[PDB]
Each structure stands twice: as structure tokens, then as C-alpha cells.
Amino acid sequence: TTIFSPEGRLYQVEYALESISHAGTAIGIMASDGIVLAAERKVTSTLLEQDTSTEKLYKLNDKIAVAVAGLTADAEILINTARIHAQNYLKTYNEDIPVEILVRRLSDIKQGYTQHGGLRPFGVSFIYAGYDDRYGYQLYTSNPSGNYTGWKAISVGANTSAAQTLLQMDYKDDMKVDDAIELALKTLSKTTDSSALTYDRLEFATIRKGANDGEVYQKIFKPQEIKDILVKTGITKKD
Amino acid sequence: LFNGMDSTSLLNERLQHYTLDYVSDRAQHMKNIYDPSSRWFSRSVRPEFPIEEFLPYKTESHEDQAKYLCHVLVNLYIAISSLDIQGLISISSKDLADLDLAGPDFNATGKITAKSATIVNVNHWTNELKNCLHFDFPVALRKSLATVYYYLSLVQGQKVYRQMHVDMFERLVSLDDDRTNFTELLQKQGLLLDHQIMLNFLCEFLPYPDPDYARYELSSKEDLQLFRLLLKHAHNAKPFFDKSKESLLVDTMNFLLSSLAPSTMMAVMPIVTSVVPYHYHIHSKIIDYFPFCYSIWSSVSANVAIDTHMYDFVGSISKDVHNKILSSEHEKDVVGVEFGEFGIFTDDQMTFMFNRLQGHLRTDGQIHSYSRTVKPFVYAINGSKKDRFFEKLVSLAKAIETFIHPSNNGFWTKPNAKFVHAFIKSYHGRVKYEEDICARGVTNGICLTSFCHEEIVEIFLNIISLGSQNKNPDIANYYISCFAYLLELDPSNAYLIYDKILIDLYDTLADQFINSRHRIISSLKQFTRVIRFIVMDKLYRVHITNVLSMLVSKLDMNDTNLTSNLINGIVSIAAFIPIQDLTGEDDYISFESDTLPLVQQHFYHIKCGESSKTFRVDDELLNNAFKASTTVFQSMLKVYVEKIFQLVDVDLEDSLVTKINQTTMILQESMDDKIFNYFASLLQRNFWSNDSFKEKDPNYELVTIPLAALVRRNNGLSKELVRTLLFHIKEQIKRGAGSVRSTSEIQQRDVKLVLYLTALNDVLRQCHESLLEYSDELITFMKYLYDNVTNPPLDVITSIVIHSALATLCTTEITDCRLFPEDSKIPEKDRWGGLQFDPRRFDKQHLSFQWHVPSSDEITLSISILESLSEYCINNVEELMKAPRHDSEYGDMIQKYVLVMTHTLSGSSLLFDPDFNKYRRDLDIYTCNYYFGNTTEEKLQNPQYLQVHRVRARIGHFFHKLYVFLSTNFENNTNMFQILLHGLKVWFTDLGQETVFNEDPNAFIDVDFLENVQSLSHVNEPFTRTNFAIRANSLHQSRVLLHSTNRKASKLENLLLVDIIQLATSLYPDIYKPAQGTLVHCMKQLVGSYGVVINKIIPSLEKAIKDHDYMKIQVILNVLLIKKIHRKLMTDYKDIGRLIFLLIECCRVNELEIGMYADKILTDIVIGIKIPSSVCVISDQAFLPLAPPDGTINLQVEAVKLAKKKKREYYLSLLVDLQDKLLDKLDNEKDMGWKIRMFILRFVTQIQSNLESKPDKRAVFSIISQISTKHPEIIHLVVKSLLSTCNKIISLSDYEYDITRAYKNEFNPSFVEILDTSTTSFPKTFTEEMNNFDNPKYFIDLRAYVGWLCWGRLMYVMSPKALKLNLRENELEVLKTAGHLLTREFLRDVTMNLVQDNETRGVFSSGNVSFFSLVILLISSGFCE
Amino acid sequence: PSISDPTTLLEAERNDPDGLGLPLKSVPEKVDAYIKKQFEIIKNLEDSVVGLNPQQFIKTDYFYRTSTIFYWIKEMARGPNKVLLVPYLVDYVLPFLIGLVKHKDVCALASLDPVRLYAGLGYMPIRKNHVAAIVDYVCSSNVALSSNQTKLQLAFIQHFLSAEL
């Protein structure tokens, strides 16, 4: 009902934070030449359509992606608002939206749903990723409170604490995107509740530069490409 | 028989040693059992209601109760003198050669036959003795048992079930068991118990000089729970500490006083309250420590932790001196302790406590236990010098009066409500304690007078009036509960309480409070509490039938809460009053012309402002107005039935529907035959001529349970009621009811058919022998009902007809619950209160109940119905087994006959017998009434016993023939598997007792409901004939449900259990969840059944993992998580080995949520149980009191010591083997991820940290090498497991390889020395030693306490000289293996990984500090480089 | 108290005929004289503040002494030390606290609360011996008190009488 606890703390935000603390794990890592996003997906359903095109990971425009921990129903309302804002910026300025302007845009909407008592807050945590000329490769996180922070590597959702410790000891400022592929897969295999990692339990993506000077490219990996980085990395659930 | 107890002359000398050598006459034994001067004397008070003499069959002989107890005591002795107080080793009857059971270890249930098996578990045989305590045994055998359960409750070294052992001593020393104070009888027998074993165990909760050797610490929840449990045992045993040891009080105080400091306050104060006895010698008295308690208490603010122990102390000392002054024993025990104005309290102490008492009710709320708080004040009052005490109580009540008032809610409300209730309850407990001394002796003049009960009403009447109007209804109930205690004192002031409750009750029923729902509800609550006292007084009794008809006419279909409070009043009126016309053919009498005039005059007098003591009327007018009051009952019942038919359509709660059935039946049992005949002809006319079954889901029970209660009272009504019902059933089937299919709902076209069928089911369950008349007709109607209706929801109802028909014929139960019997018993018509407060309430001529005991004609009908309806259903399904169809009809037909075959097994359930499979001793203490006889000899010499068993078997064989049919043709079809599983559940469970249909609402009055209505605190059996009747019914019912059904299989149970195990493993949730519940129940029924279940589930998981049978694997892991299977895994070392490797293979199945369930099971297997190696620190008095005279039992306890020892070692060789096979898997598999790798670490850590387990350097190397995984949590687990393995090696040196020193007080390690602080200059030696940094003479790590208040005890201290280890070779090699791997590089990357995990938490860990302290030992010992 | 013997403790507590024993804790005589000397230093330093405004009162040695003894009383009045303070009530502590109440702007510049402290001292565990001296002190009429001090004395007599019902 958006009233303070006597400590000056918001009960609804704390309960929304309890909800996302169950909501599946996501890791993001910022290499010297690209960003990696990975998310672990609890497929307890055989008849759920794996090889559906998205669940945890989404495009916001041609150079920005997100991972979702939380309610996917809540996330998709924010994701569409961010997509509309990215194209409305591109229409106005003829230029691609800077990552800080969009990440904090979704952090200002999520704060409003925490102040007015007719609205429940959004049960979603986002690990944003992208490139722009103002900064370069940027990795941000945002949570049900409307707080947002810049990171070199971060986890959200379940098992955050184990994942942050594993990131901290292996992360290097000068590492390449293929080292961040390896690291994010290792971290998730060293954090997972499921017995071993496999291509349908895993959502993956990258924000590389490629060979051509003007390019930045956002491969949100199809299952067969994820099977290749799995067998190359030594996670290798292979015949 | 292992025990030797088959010998007649050993039984004879055992019986005589246990003093169970009773005289063979019932009459002479029942005489000398209550004679203080007799060899066999178990009770000082004779029971007023001998509840087992009112049964219609021969309960077991005192000779056979003696025989049963003697068997229990030799087996309880063998269990304790064999030293296995944890019970887990599970010695087999096979281990007798070298010269299978579940439940009892925690949360036990009793297998009450003394059969050929001997189990040697202390937890099993104490549960048998808890059941034996239902009968009697001499106080000299009670002395022995109180001695045993004292020392057996103080055992150390293993994980005993201490809580039921403490509660066993508490039952043996009871202050009230049928008004007998067994502590004072045991004190007269000369029971003496050792305070030093208790005091020492409580002193293990004091701070120990080395942090590493402190055996118990508060804040840890298990040790806090253990402390609270031993404190309870210290309180219960305190009265048996020896009077003649004159120094005991002063020496125990001298020890505890000197131990008192801020660190020890929370231990020492409860130890002082609990252990120190109240002895009163010429020189030393417990009252000398009042100045000391007032010194602690007077110097601190009100705090719950300090205040609860000192109210308990001074309260129980006050109660003891008061009790000793009233008893004759004060000339021995309290001479020179005079009772004063305030008891033992001086004026300043009582002035202080009254100030401290209001200090909590008005300012700080610091009370926890109110019954302890009020006890100094209740036992302060001198009944001959009272005026200065009552002057403090009027001024206490005046201080708190404003904090009671209903608009003043806050923190003080719960304090005040509970203080008022506890003071009034406790004062009434004092009054009724000393009234009982007065009744058989003399009055001391410290005893309270009438003037004191008057003064108490004058103080508390306004308080109870204000507090009963509270906004919280549980707070209001505390004050409303006080009125009954104030009326039970019989004060001269009692008119003040009755006048108030009449005024408010007339003002509610006249709608004067219509805006104020708390006045409506609280006045109904107040009136309900006092009906039983208003009924006895000749003036206020004129009001009750006027109130009864006003309550009945006010019953409501909208307000379910008002209806509940009206029904409380109506049943409370009904339970105490005879619903009878008392008019003497006085043709002048009328309610309108005598009663209602006088009621208006009394009410008008009372409401003017006058007391009822001013109201004058002739006894002639009063008796005419009372007699006239009884003529109004038939019009009240007309409105009652009319309201009951309106409640059939209301959306009621099950609790209120049940309460409405209870009031309707209590009314019927209170009627004379005149009023009841009118009500019975009124309950059947309205039933046929109703407009009252309209809604989707009617309350059929509200009319059909009343019709069945008519038929319970009068068998003659059944013929026309049943005949008319079955005519109305046949008509509804002809109109097409039940001919349109639906599933999970009764259609609205079927509601009248459901009414007549449920009315038929209920009426049949009460027909008893009236069924013989129309039995043929009912059987031919039952066939017709199975032929003509096929809707699945109606099959459950139509099949329950046979249950109810069969059940009546073979059930033993009370027919008569009447308030007054027969229309023909001797009590005069002056009986308006139900004899509740008379001596003749207990009279055998008042309590001549009448029972349905089954006839030979009714059993012959029962067997005839059973075999006819079962043959019918077998033959009908077998004709559908030819040519199956997938049609919806085909399934619903199969379900019907299978359902019918489940309700022929119910009801006839009382004819089956668990022991039939043994035939082709056994002392059953509970003699549930059987028909074929209690002996094997009787049972098999009746051909109806064999005929009944033949049918059970033939229905069971049909359920297997059906399971193969359904699994081959219809393996998807869930509802007929659910019906089959319910058929199998009933077939496995209901042998000789009824377990389904046991707890659902029925046409007997509820014993808990009538006990809640008629029970009154500190009053003995304040009950009427209805309540005595249903208590005698409850007794026989208990014996039937306490009769043990555990048995060994006959091949048919195994075939059917294997089908239950298959269905429990099935892939459909709707089959497996029922089947797993059935499996739990069928395991309870069979011995060794867990072995048969795990023998099937382990191979099946192995086959499923091989086959990639995802779905089945997760179902199997849900079977392993069944509490009964899961708990048995922990104590099953032979199959846990193969289970663990199979769960490790399951931990790499990536599908569904498998691996996550196997991880949960493996996480729980880390709480597996180890066996202490000869770690049993016990007194010989834990078993020597029960040692029989004979030479043979010594040799048998020596045999069990040896055999069990081998089993313990065999379980310790399986865990060592499993450790080695997991470490093998840990080193061999370089790629095993982390969750599984961390399962080998925790499991090996638990085996390597236990003191019984031998050290192993490969464990240490393998666990240390997991640093190389770089996983944070594996590194945390490695430092913790290294530390735990080395703290064991260190302690193996300090205990000097004698593991038992770990569990002995009076052993202190060689680095601990004992200082005598009594020495003549020690107080200054300590302050100059505590200043000494240069050359310390000793040290005190942890916390000091000795010398804060005073010196004088032994202080434990740590010496200056360093801890050099005196280890042996194997221990030296493991520490050198750690020290060799404790490299600079290992330390560097351990510490770096602790730094990086702590980056967000920023905590300080004592586990890391003790790791550097361990490294320093390896450095200083030269093991580390 | 660190009594040399359990029986010497028992005799010493039985020696008061009222059956309430000695105080559980007591200040040793040199420590007692140190405590009393801090208040006598404050009483002699009163001359150094007679003329001056709160802003420079905050800069005096008298105020630094007073602010320290406030924090000492306030910490002694919590937890296990209230009994140590009841011997100093009528001679030093209560006279000191009504003394502070005249300086209401000094109690605003420094966040002191003599009112809440003194009123709260009425709830301390006061012995039967001390009740009569507390009563004679609060029942002493001095015309030297301003309304704030006399209504504080009534506020004490409110939380004292209610805590002495």
C-alpha cells in the first residue's frame, strides 16, 4: 500500500525483492571488446516450447539487450516502453539511444509504481547491455526499487551471492569477449541448482564488434550456437 | 522366550519382588488397595466413578494387569541394564544365536500385546509402562519406578529420548491422580533421591574455563531446551532430597551463592528456584534466603528473566508452609515458621511484592507466568488476621481498575486479564484444597472463611464486569471465566452476580442493546457460564424455561455468530435441566398465570435497583411458579424443529453444524418419554412435509442425525421410518433421479434422493436389533438400489447403506445417554439441576446404563448381509471383466461394485481379527469387546469366525484380480484406481476396529463437547448422567481403537502391498499421491514392511536411471521423502550405502527437477545417526531398583551388552567403508562438478569429527586438496572440516584416549586446576593475581563469576604451562599430514578466498580465528613448516 | 560486593530487621568520594557562569563538567547500574538535575534533556530507606525554584507516587 516501515523502508519493495530472489539467475560480463549476457531458465515442463525465440533475454534496439529476473508479464510492459523510447529518441535525434538514458528511463517508471498506493511495484530486475560512442560497452543493473548501478560483471535473481564471489576472483579488466563467454558459462555451471548446464536451460547473447569498423552486432544465440560455445568451453555435454 | 518369563515359578517370585502378589479376590484386593496399612496399596482416594465397572463385559482381572506390568518391568530393566538408552542398534532375535520395527525412538505408539518378541529398546518399554499406568500398582513399586526414572532421565553419553523419560517420572510422582498426592505417599514410603547428580548436570550450564570444553551453552536452542527439561526434572524431584542431611540446604546455597555474577545470573537463579529444597531445620531455614532474594529483586528494575524465578521461589515456599500447617506434619517440618498477617512474608516484603505486582499490571508488563506470579499473594492470607492483607488487595484493585475498562486497550490488557483470571482461579484452588482438609479433620484458622469469599467478590465483581466487555473476544473470555469460580465459592454475596447476569440477559433478549453487539454476545457468554448455578437457586430457577424459549425463538439464518452464541446457551440449559413437565395434576397451574407474573415482579424489583435479597415471595407461590415453568416445553420444541429446517439451507461452518447436532441430541436425552414422544412425532412429520432442501448443497446432517438419535433412544420407531424412506427412494429413482451422469457434483434433480439415502444411512446405523424385523426387505432393496442408479457421486452414498446396516449388528455401544432414566428412577422431582453437585450423582442406581451388546441373531444377520452383498459385487464385476468397454458407463459400473465391496469391509470390520493369520500368553491388556471371545481357543471353535475370515480373503484376492485387469486395459483411468486404492486402504487398516467413519459426525454425543460444558476447575467430576454415559462409551471405544493391528503378512498382504508399491511409483499424480498415503498406512499394519518397500524402490530407481525413465525417477525421489521412509533411512546402514551411490548417479540426470530432489535427500542423509562407543554415564540406581531376585537375568543383560556391542561396531564399519568409497570417488573423478563433490566433504566431515571414529590421513589429504577447485563454498567447508577433524585429535589427547571423560563431570583436563576460594586470604590474592602481567600464576579464559557476590566455592582455572599434546602414532601422522599441506601457498590462497567471499558481508568469524589458532598449534608442535 | 564468605553475606543481609537485605551492589568508599568530589567541583565552579549567555556558557569548564556528569548519570540510569545512582539521588544527582533545568537554551545548544532524565528517575528501584529521604526532599518547599523546576518536581512526584502506589 506504499507506506513506510518505522525504519523509513518500503514493505512492498522488500516483498517485490523477496519475489525476484526466487526468479532464476542471470549473469552479465563486460569484456574489453564486447558484452556477454547469460541466463538460467527452469524448464520443469517437457511440453513447454523450448526454441521459442525469447523468455529471459530481449532486444531493446539494434545495440541494446536485457536479461530479466522477475515476472515476465511485468518485464514485457517495461520492455515495450523502453523499445518505444529508443525509437522515439532515434526519430528525434537521428542517432541511436545512449545506454544510460534508457536504463535510467526504466528506473524512473519503476520508482513511480513504488510511491502511489494504487499501484503495486514491478517484480523485475534487469541486467542491461549495449554500446554507444559516449562511453563504449556498458553493463548496468536495475531492480524493483528504481535503483540502478554500473558494473564490469554482475548477477541478478537467485544465487546472486555465490555468483558475485565467482565473478570477482576470475574477472580481469583486459579480457576479450571469448574469455567472457568462458567465464559466464563457468560461473553459471559453478552456481546452478540443476545438476549440469545444457543448451535449453541456458539463454545466451553477445554484443561484439565483428570485422567491419562501423559494426556492432547483437547475436541473441539460437540453441545450436549455444551448443557450440558449450562444447568449446569444456562444459561440453557431448557424445 | 528370551526373557525366561514363560516359567511359572520365576513369574511368582518376580510378582512378589515387584509386590504385585495381590489377593485373588476382587473384593479383598479392591479393599486393601486403599488401606494405608496394606502390602498392596496404590491409591489414598477411592474413585467416585470407577469408569471401567460401567462396561457391559468383563474387563481384565487385577491378576492379569499385574502379570502384564511385571512383564513390562523385567523388559524395561533389561533395556536399561544393557546400557543402550538411545535404542538405535536394533538387536535382532537372531543375535541370540551367536552365544525390523519402526516408530518408538521419537514420537512413539504402543503395540500393547505382550507377545513372543522381545525388543530391548528403553523407548519402546517406557511407552508400554505409560499405557500400564492406566491401571494401579503399589506405592513400593511406584518408589522403585520413581527411582529408575530419576536416574534414567539424567543419562549422559548418547542421544536419549529424555523428554518422555522426564514426563514418566512426573506421572509417577503426581500431585493429583484421582485426588491422590503421590509425592506425599512416596515421601511416606521414604523415597530419597540424589540432589548431587542433578546439581552437577545443571552446573554443566555454567561457564567452563576453556571455550573448547564447554559441553553445553545457552543461546543454542537444543541446550536451552535441555536446560529447561532438566530444570523441570529438578522441580519434580526436589521433595525427595533428604531431611536428615542438615547441611544440604546451606551447602547447596553456599555453592550457588558464590557462583552468582552477571554472566551466570540466567543459570543460577533457575537452579536456586529448582534444586534447593524447603527443609526448615532448627538452625538453617529456606526463609533465611528471603533477605537474599529480596536483595537481588529489590536492586533491579522489573525484568521477566529476574522476576519469574523469584515469584516462583517465594510463591512455592509460601504454598509449602501453608500446606504443611494444614497437614499434621508441621510439628516435624515447619515449627518456628509462624504464619503472621501475610504468611511467611514480613510487612516490608509484602509491601514490596504488592508494589512489584502493580509495577507490572500498570507500568511495565513484565510477567510471563501468571499462575506463579499470584501464588505468594493467594497463600499469604491468614484467614483469622486477614484485614491488612485485604486492605492491600482493595488498594491493588483500585489502582488497576482503570486499566481494565474497555476503551483503555494497550500493552497492559493481556497482563491484567490473565492476572485477574489467575488470582481468582488460584484463590478458588486454595479454597477447595483447604475445604478438602476441613472435610476429614479440623479447621486451622489460617483457612479462609465465608467473609473472605465475600471480600473477594466485593473486590473483583466490578473488575470482571469491566473486563468482560473488551474489544478482543479472547481477552473478554478471561474475565467471563472468573464468574464460575466466584459462584462455586457459594458466597453470601452471590446474589450480586446472578442479579447482574439476569438484568443484562433480559436487556439483550428484549433488544435494549440492539446497537451494541458486544453486549449481545458477552451477555450470552456470561449467562452460559452461570446457567449451572442459576439452575440450583430456588428463586433464579423460575427464569430458565422463559430464557430457553426466548433463545430458541431468536435463532438466526443470517447471523451465524449470534446463532453460535444462542446455541451455546440452549445446550447449556439442556445439559443441566430435565425437559419434563413437573406439574402434579394441579389444574390451577399455568405458565401465563403463575410463572410469568412472578418473573415480571422479580425482574422489576432487580431492575429498580434493589438486591434480590430484598425480594420476598411465599415458597407456595415460588413452587407454583417453578412447576408452571415446566409446562412450556412442547411449544419451544415446535419452534426448535422449525428453526432446524430453516438452517438446512444456510451456508454454515462444519463446527456450527456439529454444535447444532450436539444441542439437538442433548435436548433429546434430557426429555421424559412424554415430551420426547411429542418431539419424535414432531421430528418425523416435519421431515416428510418439509419445504427445506432447495439449495445446491444442503445440510442433510441437521435433520438426519436427529432422526438417527430418535432411533437410538427408541428402536420401535425404525420400522415405519425406514419403510417410508425406502418407498420415497424408489419413487425418486422412478422419477429419474441419478439417471443423468455427472462427476464430482450431486445434481439438483437428485437432492431428495440424497436426503432419503443419507437419512437411511444414519437411521440404519442406529436401528441395532430393530433391523432384524425388516432385514430381508432391506437386502432386496439394496440389490435394487445397486441395479438402478449408476451416477458416480451417488455410488459412494448408496454403498454406505451396507456399512451402516452391518455396523449396527456387530458394534458394542451405549444406547442410553438419558439425563434421568427409564421414566422410572428414585430421585424426587426436585431434580432441576442434573444431580451435578450431589453425592448421589455417582450412584450405581442413577448410572445403570444400557448397552447394545451384539446378539447371536444380529451377528448371524451381519455375516449373512456381508457374504450376500460381497458375492453379488464380485459376480457383477467378473461379468464386466468379459468384454471391457471404454464407455463412461463401463467405468462407473465397475466403480459401484468395487465401492460396495469397500463398505461391506467397513462396518463388518468389528468381526475381523488381526491374529487370524497366526493360527492355521499373548496378553492383550486392552480388552476391546470381541464377539467370538478373547482366547484363540474360543475363536476357532466357532464356525462363524472362519466364515468371516474366508470372506475378507476372497474380497482381497478380488482386488488383486482387479488390479491386473485395470493395469492391462485401462491404465490411464485414474478414478477407478483411486477407488481400488481406497478399497485396499480399508482392507489393510480395518481389522477388529473402524478407522474410516471413526471421526466424522454421527448420532452419539461428543465427549469433548460435553466435557467442555460440564467441567469446572478444582471440582471433581461435576457431570450429569449423559456425560457419565458417553464417558463409559468413550472408554470401550478407546479399548477398540487401542487394540493393536500390527501383524506379519500371509502372502496375500504381500501381493497387495507390492501392487500398492507399484501404484506409488505410477506416473499419474492422482494415482501416486493416494497410493503413497496408502503405503504409509499399510507399513504401519505390517512388521518389517520398510525392508520390503526399500527392497523394491532401490532396484526400481536403478532400473529407471538405466532406462532414462524421467518422470518415474522424480516420483521415486518423492517416495524417499515420505517422513516414515526418510526417518528409517537414517538408521539403516546396509541399504544407505547402495542408496548413496545411486543418488550420486541421479545427481547427473539433467531433466525436470531431478538432481535437485537427490541433492535434498543427500543433504538430509548428512543428518544420519552414529552409535556412541560404550559412552554411557549413568547411575546404578537407574536400573538396580527393578533388578529381579534371580540369577538368570544377570547372564541375559551380559548377553545383550555383547551382542548389541557387535551391531554398533558393525554399523561403525559400514560408515568407515562408505567414507572410503566416497573418498575414492572424490580423488578418482577429476570432473565431478561441485554440489556432488561437496556431498563427499560434509559426509566425511561428520564421520571424521565424531569421537568414536578412527582418524585417517587420506581423508585429511583429500579434503585439503579440494582447495584446488577454487569454489568459495568448498573452501569454506575445507577450513571448517580441517578445524573440526583437528579439534577432535586435540580432544583425544586431553581426554587421554578415554572417550567417556568427554561426558563425565569430576574430570577436568590436565591444563585445568581447581582453586579453593574459601582460604583465609584468597579475596586479596585474586586481585593481585588479576593485576599480574609479568609472571601469571594461572589464567581464566572465557568468563569469570566466582567471587562477584561472594567467595567460598571451588574455582576452575587454566594453568600457565603450555598445551603439549601427548598423542599416539596414528594421530601424529594425520596432524603431520595437515602440517605438511599447511604451506605458505595453501594459507595464502585459502585466506585470499575468505577475503573475497567476505567482500559484501564484512562479518568477523570465530571459525577463521580458530583456524589460525589451529595453525599455531601445528607450528608450535613442529608439524608445520 | 565480593563478600569473603557465604555466611558473612547471609548474616549481613539478615541484620536489617525489615527482611529486605542489603543492596546487591555498592560503591567502595574511595570511589564514592571521587563521585561526590565531581559534584562539589561543579558546585564551586557555579560562580564562573553567573553573568554570561548560552553561546559562551557552552565554552566554560563548568559546562564541560556538567555535560560529562549528565552523560554519567544518563548511562548509570540504564541497565544494571540504577542501584548505584539511588545513594546519590537526594544529596547530589537530583539537586544537580534541577540545577541544569534553569539553563534551557544550554540544553538546546547541546542536545541535553534534564526533564526526561529527572522525570524518568522516579521509576528507579528505590529502597524503603531511601523512599523517606526522597519524599522529604521532594516535599521540601524552596521559593528558589522557578515554575519549570516546581512543575518538574510535581512531574517527578507524578512518576514517583505512581511507581510507589
UniProtKB/Swiss-Prot annotation, chain A:
Tree of life domain: Eukaryota
PROSITE patterns according to UniProt: PROTEASOME_ALPHA_1 (PS00388), PROTEASOME_ALPHA_2 (PS51475)
A Pfam family annotated for this UniProt entry: Proteasome
Cellular component annotations (GO), alphabetically ordered: cytosol; nucleus; proteasome complex; proteasome core complex, alpha-subunit complex; proteasome storage granule
Placement of covalent cross-link Glycyl lysine isopeptide (Lys-Gly) (interchain with G-Cter in ubiquitin): K91, K190, K222
Localization of this protein: Cytoplasm; Nucleus
Keywords per UniProt: Cytoplasm, Isopeptide bond, Nucleus, Proteasome, Ubl conjugation
UniProt keyword annotation of Cytoplasm present: yes
Matches recorded under InterPro entries: Ntn_hydrolases_N, Proteasome_alpha, Proteasome_alpha-type, Proteasome_asu_N, Proteasome_bsu_CS, Proteasome_sua/b
UniProt-listed GO biological process terms: proteasomal ubiquitin-independent protein catabolic process; proteasome core complex assembly; proteasome-mediated ubiquitin-dependent protein catabolic process
Its job: The proteasome degrades poly-ubiquitinated proteins in the cytoplasm and in the nucleus. It is essential for the regulated turnover of proteins and for the removal of misfolded proteins. The proteasome is a multicatalytic proteinase complex that is characterized by its ability to cleave peptides with Arg, Phe, Tyr, Leu, and Glu adjacent to the leaving group at neutral or slightly basic pH. It has an ATP-dependent proteolytic activity.
Record-stated family: Belongs to the peptidase T1A family.
Self-association state and partner proteins as the record states: The 26S proteasome consists of a 20S proteasome core and two 19S regulatory subunits. The 20S proteasome core is composed of 28 subunits that are arranged in four stacked rings, resulting in a barrel-shaped structure. The two end rings are each formed by seven alpha subunits, and the two central rings are each formed by seven beta subunits. The catalytic chamber with the active sites is on the inside of the barrel.
Note: Present with 17100 molecules/cell in log phase SD medium.
NCBIfam families xref list: PRK03996.1 (NF003075)
Protein name: Proteasome subunit alpha type-3
Species of origin: Saccharomyces cerevisiae (strain ATCC 204508 / S288c) (Baker's yeast)
Phylogenetic placement of the source organism: Eukaryota, Fungi, Dikarya, Ascomycota, Saccharomycotina
From Swiss-Prot, chain B:
Keywords: Cytoplasm, DNA damage, DNA repair, Nucleus, Phosphoprotein, Repeat
Gene symbol of the encoding locus: BLM10
Subunit structure: According to PubMed:12973301, colocalizes with nascent proteasome. According to PubMed:15778719, associates with proteasome core particles and also forms a complex with regulatory particle-core particle (RP-CP).
Compartment(s) of residence: Nucleus; Cytoplasm
Protein name: Proteasome activator BLM10
GO biological process: DNA damage response; DNA repair; proteasomal ubiquitin-independent protein catabolic process; proteasome assembly; proteasome core complex import into nucleus; proteasome storage granule assembly; regulation of proteasomal protein catabolic process
Family: Belongs to the BLM10 family.
Keyword set includes DNA damage: yes
Domain of life: Eukaryota
Domain comment as written in the entry: The bromodomain-like (BRDL) region specifically recognizes and binds acetylated histones.
Lineage of origin: Eukaryota, Fungi, Dikarya, Ascomycota, Saccharomycotina
GO CC annotations on file: cytosol; nucleus; proteasome storage granule
Function: Associated component of the proteasome that specifically recognizes acetylated histones and promotes ATP- and ubiquitin-independent degradation of core histones during DNA damage response. Recognizes and binds acetylated histones via its bromodomain-like (BRDL) region and activates the proteasome by opening the gated channel for substrate entry. Binds to the core proteasome via its C-terminus, which occupies the same binding sites as the proteasomal ATPases, opening the closed structure of the proteasome via an active gating mechanism.
Further facts: Present with 2600 molecules/cell in log phase SD medium.
Example GO molecular function: lysine-acetylated histone binding
HEAT repeats: 1092-1131
